[PDB]
Design a protein around this nucleic acid. Structure first.
Length: 96
RNA sequence: AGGGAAACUGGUCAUCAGGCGAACUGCGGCGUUCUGCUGGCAAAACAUAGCUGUUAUGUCAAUGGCUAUUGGAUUGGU
């Protein structure tokens, strides 16, 4: 359901892809929502939700592994976290 | 630490590694091995030459192992 948007995210605007990039984006107050995998590590999973609360940045915990969230964007490798200028298709509604 | 990767790239004799962060850059960090230069150290030891116990010179320069054994390193399989 949400992969319909997340395909068009790659077309529309810029996005970060992993834990090093997403934490730099959250520190700057730049990233406006962020998406977990199921199997993201229990150091980073606790830490990323903390900065998302502090920023006022929206959270979308996606069921399915880093394999599924990797091939959601289309690229042929495993990605635990994707954070995300210009929305793809109304992400205000679809996150809820 | 920076860097932020599909036109996938890097790598082994072989399997492989990477957004849980690769290539790549630092006169990075650190461990274990390595080359050179010393100290120990020529006073010793050894080989020539000569004198009746000791005085002379000399032990140099270059650079491979497809050979073996040993120590160690990097890995794999069962």
């Amino acid at each position: 359901s949400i992969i319909n948007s997340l395909s068009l995210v790659t077309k529309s605007g810029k996005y970060q892809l992993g834990i090093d990039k997403t934490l730099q984006s959250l520190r700057n107050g730049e990233a406006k929502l962020v998406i977990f995998a199921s199997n993201v590590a229990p150091a980073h999973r606790s830490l990323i939700e903390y900065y998302a609360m502090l920023s006022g940045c929206d959270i979308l915990p996606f069921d399915g592994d880093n394999v599924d969230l990797g091939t959601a964007c289309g690229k042929y490798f495993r990605s635990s976290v994707i954070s995300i200028a210009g929305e793809s298709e109304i992400l205000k509604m679809i996150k809820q």
